[PDB]
Amino acid sequence: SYTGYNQEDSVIMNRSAVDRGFFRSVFYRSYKEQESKKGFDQEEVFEKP
């Protein structure tokens, strides 16, 4: 019980260890988009407006 910040199932982490890569992780989010020509009137394409 160091300073009361680990009470009730909480944890005190070393900031210096975190600075060194301790439990550093990557998060990858993948986004998929498809262009559909269904419908003669509407024809969506990829291009910067």
Binding site: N14, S16, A17, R20, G21, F22
Partner: protein, 64 residues
């Protein structure tokens, strides 16, 4: 994936000991003997090499 540069606990350099550590193990050193040969006295630094998994080796088996 790759050996950390610093020991998390104390900041000691560990990134230049993985290759030597593997070489020492190939020389029939016990894991503890190899760590002592490498100057890793604190068990926080011994933890770094004793528990390291070098996934970068298998990641290089995939062609870029």
């Amino acid at each position: 994936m790759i050996i950390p540069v610093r020991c998390f606990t104390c900041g000691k350099i560990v990134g230049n000991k993985w290759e030597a550590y593997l070489g020492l193990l190939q020389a029939e050193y016990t894991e503890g003997d190899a760590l002592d040969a490498l100057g890793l006295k604190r068990y926080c630094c011994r933890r770094m090499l004793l528990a390291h998994v070098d996934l970068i080796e298998k990641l290089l088996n995939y062609a870029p």
